[PDB]
Design an enzyme around this catalytic site. Structure first.
Site, PDB file in Angstrom:
ATOM      1  N   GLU C  29      83.907  62.347  43.366  1.00 25.73           N
ATOM      2  CA  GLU C  29      85.008  63.068  42.675  1.00 25.73           C
ATOM      3  C   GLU C  29      86.289  64.202  42.826  1.00 25.73           C
ATOM      4  OE1 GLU C  29      82.992  65.470  39.411  1.00 25.73           O
ATOM      5  OE2 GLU C  29      85.427  65.753  38.142  1.00 25.73           O
ATOM      6  N   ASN C  74      84.428  64.969  35.628  1.00 29.12           N
ATOM      7  CA  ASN C  74      85.737  65.438  34.143  1.00 29.12           C
ATOM      8  C   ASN C  74      87.371  65.598  34.738  1.00 29.12           C
ATOM      9  OD1 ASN C  74      83.353  67.071  32.888  1.00 29.12           O
ATOM     10  ND2 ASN C  74      84.017  69.053  34.489  1.00 29.12           N
ATOM     11  N   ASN C 174      83.041  59.817  30.452  1.00 26.66           N
ATOM     12  CA  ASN C 174      82.196  60.945  31.866  1.00 26.66           C
ATOM     13  C   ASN C 174      82.352  61.958  30.316  1.00 26.66           C
ATOM     14  OD1 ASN C 174      81.256  62.448  33.812  1.00 26.66           O
ATOM     15  ND2 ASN C 174      82.932  63.860  33.233  1.00 26.66           N
ATOM     16  N   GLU C 175      81.264  62.409  29.896  1.00 30.64           N
ATOM     17  CA  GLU C 175      80.747  64.097  29.442  1.00 30.64           C
ATOM     18  C   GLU C 175      81.767  64.138  28.502  1.00 30.64           C
ATOM     19  OE1 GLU C 175      80.676  66.561  32.611  1.00 30.64           O
ATOM     20  OE2 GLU C 175      78.182  66.967  32.891  1.00 30.64           O
ATOM     21  N   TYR C 246      71.623  68.895  35.916  1.00 23.55           N
ATOM     22  CA  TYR C 246      71.477  70.317  36.956  1.00 23.55           C
ATOM     23  C   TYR C 246      70.421  71.635  36.136  1.00 23.55           C
ATOM     24  CZ  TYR C 246      76.002  68.033  38.248  1.00 23.55           C
ATOM     25  OH  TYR C 246      77.034  66.546  38.289  1.00 23.55           O
ATOM     26  N   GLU C 300      74.764  61.818  36.862  1.00 22.48           N
ATOM     27  CA  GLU C 300      74.710  63.387  37.732  1.00 22.48           C
ATOM     28  C   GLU C 300      72.940  64.378  37.378  1.00 22.48           C
ATOM     29  OE1 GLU C 300      78.417  65.015  36.680  1.00 22.48           O
ATOM     30  OE2 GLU C 300      79.444  63.809  36.115  1.00 22.48           O
ATOM     31  N   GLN C 369      77.148  65.986  45.087  1.00 22.44           N
ATOM     32  CA  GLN C 369      78.205  64.842  44.724  1.00 22.44           C
ATOM     33  C   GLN C 369      78.344  64.970  46.127  1.00 22.44           C
ATOM     34  OE1 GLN C 369      81.810  65.774  43.517  1.00 22.44           O
ATOM     35  NE2 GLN C 369      80.976  65.958  41.253  1.00 22.44           N
TER      36      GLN C 369
END
Lengths: 504, 505, 511
Positions: C29, C74, C174-175, C246, C300, C369
């Site tokens: 990212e 993001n 994304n998200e 996460y 992710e 990442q």
């Protein structure tokens, strides 16, 4: 002449709130001759190097306006902000669907910032939520406020403005509830749209003050339910809900006495209107378990006589004469009473915009290549904007009641007291809303933590008398006959009167 | 054979409405060879100064087309209208997701105006509502119809068109209901989108005639509810609702007699179909307490064999390939003849119709590359109706033997409309024989119109109903003179599977 | 030593699935220093002609990453893809709202393509669904994959890349469920949007494999119901649903033993996560009478101490009273540069095991990442690149987990946690290639203060090799820029038996 009314401050009087300077704001739109023939007219002899009418700039400075809403209004819902940036020779000629006009784009955000620098006024910038949305708003935010180095901010530097514009207060669209609005939305559509815009703009700049646009007026079917849905959804990133109210004498063409007395009691409508918009904002806080109150932004208020309301090959007109009402002394007295209501409620109302500033339903009239002059409504606003400082106080008022057909029994006298305990100066604004009977008024200002000063009276025996370009001083404030007796002073207020009395 | 059926315009005959010229409209899409190798072929020997095929233009004048829907169709849902303005050398080459093609953009709204000026046809302009929406629609509206002085309109003048194009009728997108359409919408989404667009355009120009798109067909799950939802929401700024109906012989491979009989009665489905859409249009008016009626714009109708429609390091997408190129039977022609019969019988509510499509592309007109242009069987019924159906339309009193179908009940064998221009003292009968097996004889009592002459009398029939016109034999199936014997009161025999037209004054 | 635990195959298996190569994917990212000072650093002593760091590339190869997600995250929700194409000189300098940074756009899809060519990695391209949507998605698709002879594709050719990039796997937004996301949506709004975009893209290219946004975490109030609503509507043109997971030690500031024990059993959250999303994906298929399964994409996942970022967003929010900010946004700052402990690595080892144990439905996973930002590879300014503790469990799984995946019978003494119930201490996977003879076992010890000894009995598979142990007596011991190899895998001491100390990951290759 025995006193039959009293304005007093009780001992241990708690202030309503600190007076926000933003209460004295106005609103210019690319509508009619508010901009073109108003703040901007290069042919006019008074115009400066940028083309701004200096005589208007003088009266705006005299009016005391602190913050101006720009550029709309219905106009913004089909407006592209990039069309009003950069050199004027390279700006495109566009349409405005809102008012069926040709837009030259000679005035834009670039030039309005330059105007606002000279005028000494804050800008409350409105973004397009009609034909554009999230991307364009973030683009304008960056251009307007961004540090040199980013591509959008470098354009501003290149355009002649190096420093950030410091635009802190933003309107997320115009009123999106009306069927007449380009890109009009349902309650839920707008709720989700401000949710996206408010979150994004706060993420880029947490110091922003954001306004969700409420209903077009109390006359809307979605009124109340609009506010609740929108504020509940985007509570976290909002700081203001906007509310709008216009008032006029319904029987002005027949000069009816009954409708005149209704019109004089417009403040009790506004008081009720403020309470219910505040209530909607409270329900949204409650549902979010939040700590902060969403403040109110009264970004459209004043007097407007609204009873005046391929196949086409012709070019659309430029700068037509639209909504150019001429105000009476009666009109000025109700606008005097409206500001009184705003101050008494400045704990919740933290911003207000007198719509509009020039020509369009305005306290300032600028003739087509002629002189600029003060409307009657100019004088009460100017007095308050200059002298309503410190803390606002809701005074104890004993007043005889007048019966109105629209609102029932209403106090004849209404007032607000201002106090700056470090100047140590004060101010009293009061109105006689009685259409027939004068009232003698006593004043007791004891509870303040006194010496008389300049006292004004705005009254005409014929309440339908107006100022014109021929007679711009036919109705101006006259010296108030007031006698102090120690502590308590007395004054007689005639039928349909606004007074101001400064003290120290 | 002896009289066994009759057509009379007596008391039992009901007037429909004045014949709207827009009822003889068509449709030009950037699909296959409708435009490139259709109306536009620069290298063709008949090409004009702009690249338009003159031989096609002459047939379009012969066909009687009055209004053309442009430029789509599924194509428009991923189209940027600005790609079709200015000099052709400056225009970008694009891909069209709809028909899986690369698009030169040589033909744009600029060129279609020029083509429509020469053809004498109105333009019904469709705007993108798939990949684009409101802003783009308003931009094009300004560019097209705006007076000089504004930036967009000054682009149109810089492009070689000084005058406003005067496009009056607009389509807000395409069939957004089908899951094959780019940017396809729920009933709620499209309703909200049309409400915004229709309002903003009417605000700009109150003289516009705006069309909201209905269902892709009667087969759709959201049919009925779609038009209800959309029209109720946008009523005040709408003038039309669009509806679409294609028909074909389902058992054409096996030459099934049962399928042929259903297909011949296809107009009965169209009758029911119009009524259902008219109901949805009535609801919108009644729910909004209005007096203005939402008219029906049948912007897609005609015979189309949809069961054939395959298909459903890289490679460049094809340019103007051979797509939807149907060769029409004699039976196909009498069916479309009966469909136009149904349209005219319901032209009180249906104020616009468009046969899809005009050239090469389910068309009455065919055009071969560097070759001649020729008429399909379907050309002749349309051209007769388009040139001679004027004034008042009448639904005449029909007594007919009952033919048995499968998809529908027991159906009348004969269906007819009568045109009449009272002031000009001239009229037209259009009738059809839907029977697949037995011939029928008619009595044509025209006495009743507000008592002698007969003019051109045509009969389109072929003993083998599967007979077609092709490139090598363009005139294998053509209308023949009809044997009419006025005694009066006229009488005529119609063999199984035939269309007739009789002019009179 | 006393054997108490048993890892064995039940004589007759019957695997989970063939191991997908996409399970060993990562994610780059435009965040912090993942791109700038990470994979891209033109002035670095190992920079190639395009300005990519070779030392970083060497460690990517060593890590065994097969597919990399780009560019967000993001970041992508307010990103214009054209800003990163064409000649660098003329690329505009832009704001990123997500991480509050100024972006030079020296890296874009043209450049990341070149990087991916050098790496040998597949590209997983995410498109903006925040500030942008359908039209831009189709524009980028044409630019990236179109044949020469169209305006957009000809730009790619003129920009130096003649052939189509052949990007198969695409992330549609994304998200979009997260209220932190620019242009965040409701379940219905996104369902409608992804249905439009997925259909149109697959209409342009049948061979595309499209990913819909799922939940940003198991904690989400919209968990399960988001996936159900979104997948039900857009089923036909979708191939994947995304999962985000996460984990971190919530009491790492105190070194609390309770929070540590909850953290070591983080795989249990992922197991439930997989079960719930799969069930949601299953109900979407049967609602559409579909024949095709929607696979899961854990695009992710990993260990991230998010309290550091959470406190930054609070301080930024409480800075509202001071006024407006005039200062220019920082360029490639040090953001989310977590320094991984021995325990953090053991948790990731067990997450990979759960992924392998469920790689029948999870056909893709992207560890977040790749470089500097919550990364196994750390890269210092004008200096060395080094392996974090989390590097070693990934590399072993990426380079040796081949063939079929087997879930062996496990019998271990249970342990108690606050967040979860009573959970087995030992957790393991077996990967086996029948053609021929190899062969990998990965096992984790989740107990925080009790060492265990286990019996290994393969048998049911249709000599040992390299064996490794990741354990430190101080489970908070860390690899740093100063001492980068302090926590490295040590040789294991080993029917067969081996001793696994408290908090340890094991890898044993066999043939």
């Amino acid at each position: 002449t025995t006193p039959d009314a009293s304005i007093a401050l009780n001992a241990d009087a708690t202030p309503v709130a600190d007076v926000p300077p933003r209460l004295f704001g106005s609103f210019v739109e690319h509508l009619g001759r508010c901009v073109y023939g108003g703040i901007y007219e290069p042919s006019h002899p008074t115009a400066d190097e940028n083309g701004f009418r200096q005589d208007v700039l003088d009266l705006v400075k005299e009016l005391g306006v602190t913050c101006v809403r720009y550029p709309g209004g219905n106009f913004v819902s089909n407006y592209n902000w990039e069309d009003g940036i950069g050199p004027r020779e390279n700006r495109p000629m566009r349409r405005d669907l809102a008012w069926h006009c040709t837009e030259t784009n000679e005035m834009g955000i670039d030039d309005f910032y330059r105007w606002s620098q000279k005028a000494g006024t804050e800008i409350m910038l409105a973004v397009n939520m009609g034909t554009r949305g999230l991307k364009a708003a973030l683009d304008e935010l960056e251009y307007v406020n961004g540090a040199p180095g980013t591509a959008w901010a470098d354009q501003r530097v290149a355009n002649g403005i190096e420093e950030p514009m410091d635009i802190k207060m933003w309107c997320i669209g115009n009123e999106m509830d009306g069927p007449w609005q380009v890109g009009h939305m349902s309650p839920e559509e707008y709720a989700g749209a401000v949710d996206k815009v408010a979150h994004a703009m706060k993420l880029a700049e947490s110091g922003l003050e954001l306004v969700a646009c409420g209903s077009s007026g109390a006359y809307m079917p979605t009124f109340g339910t609009w506010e609740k849905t929108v504020l509940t959804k985007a509570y976290e990133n909002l700081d203001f809900v906007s509310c709008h109210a216009y008032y006029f004498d319904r029987g002005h063409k027949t000069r009816a006495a009954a409708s005149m007395q209704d019109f004089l009691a417009s403040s009790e409508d506004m008081t009720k209107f403020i309470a219910t918009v505040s209530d909607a904002a409270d329900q949204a806080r409650e549902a979010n378990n939040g700590t902060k109150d969403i403040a109110l932004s009264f970004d459209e208020w004043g007097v407007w006589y609204s009873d005046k309301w391929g196949l086409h090959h012709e070019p659309w007109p430029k700068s037509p004469h639209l909504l150019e009402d001429i105000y009476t002394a009666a009109d000025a007295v109700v606008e005097g009473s409206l500001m009184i209501t705003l101050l008494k409620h400045c704990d919740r109302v933290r911003s207000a915009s007198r719509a509009q500033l020039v020509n369009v339903i305005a306290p300032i009239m600028a003739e087509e290549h002629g002189p600029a002059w003060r409307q009657t409504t100019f004088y009460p606003f100017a007095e308050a904007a200059l002298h309503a400082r410190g803390q606002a106080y809701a005074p104890a008022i004993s007043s005889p009641t007048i019966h109105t057909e629209a609102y029932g029994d209403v106090p004849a006298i209404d007032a607000v007291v201002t106090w700056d305990e470090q100047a140590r100066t004060g101010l009293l604004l009061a109105v006689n809303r009685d259409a027939n009977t004068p009232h003698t008024l006593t004043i007791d200002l004891s509870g303040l933590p006194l010496a008389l000063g300049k006292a004004q009276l705005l009254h005409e025996d014929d309440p339908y008398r107006t100022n014109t370009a021929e007679a711009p001083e036919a109705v101006t404030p006259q010296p108030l006959d007031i006698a102090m007796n120690t502590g308590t002073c007395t004054a007689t207020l005639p039928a349909i009167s606004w007074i101001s009395v400064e003290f120290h």
